[PDB]
Design a protein around this ligand. Sequence first.
Ligand SMILES: NCCCCn1cc(CCn2nc3c(Br)c(Br)c(Br)c(Br)c3n2)nn1
Length: 328
Amino acid sequence: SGPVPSRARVYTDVNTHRPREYWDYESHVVEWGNQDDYQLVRKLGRGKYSEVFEAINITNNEKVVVKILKPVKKKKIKREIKILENLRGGPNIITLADIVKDPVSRTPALVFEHVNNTDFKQLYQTLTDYDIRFYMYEILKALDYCHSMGIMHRDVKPHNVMIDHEHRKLRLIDWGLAEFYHPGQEYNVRVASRYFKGPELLVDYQMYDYSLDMWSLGCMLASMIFRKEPFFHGHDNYDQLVRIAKVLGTEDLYDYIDKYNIELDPRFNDILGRHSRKRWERFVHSENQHLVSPEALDFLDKLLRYDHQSRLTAREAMEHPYFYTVVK
Ligand SMILES: NCCCCn1cc(CCn2nc3c(Br)c(Br)c(Br)c(Br)c3n2)nn1
């Protein structure tokens, strides 16, 4: 037979009318800067692809963040670089300050604007209902920009969202898994963190689009307004889909895979079972009710849907009554 193809309902042909130089990152030419301008202060942490350091730009005494990449495909590095430069200056998008050669690692090092960030561990215990709506709207501005620029993040999660709660500044970071959207193109389903993987990734559907980020955003919103991080807490990719099925039901899951003619992994036969769709009021209790509103539930409901085409776009989401309270 063969799976039914899909198209993004918005920003479908953005890259089709861009010059090749815009999306052809394999032929991109990296403009190298001087590594001597930066002095490593302290090690912020290590990722699976890089090491992150706090540093100082000794040419202007400004504080910066250095991302020393570990040896990976050259094509992947130029992808992150080209994407960062294309999205440079956009709303709440992290600013790529410079690109330098690290003398030790012998790999590129990405220099970013510094953000006085508080970890989301202590932060999500201090956010009011207003704070949640505000930061959700700030993220949407970032997602809508990169989606309009024809770019697909594929790793939206609290860790990739820097927040300076003092000056109320937000920055969407880590565009190493980001990609250009081309209509009809199959992508790698092995993206994003497990808890934020969309159903399309879990059922191995490759022709996805910008709406993947909207599911991830929905997972974040659900964890924040219900005080349950993460909302969908599976121990693996297979159990992850089951956790989702226990809330959204299995009947809408089959409709989803029948529509796109997707065959489910046969190992789901002994673990999925049958589940009704639950109402969102179920997860509301006296400890989080102050963060919950009818508008919140309706907005969340329109984000968390099996069908990636029936999800709210970033632009649509910004029009939702949930953000009427937000000061603009
Ligand atoms: N392969 C994953 C890369 C990140 C690993 N990592 C970093 C940290 C410390 C927290 N942190 N990371 C920041 C990054 Br990346 C930027 Br850009 C900026 Br600006 C700030 Br502020 C960051 N803070 N733990 N694991």
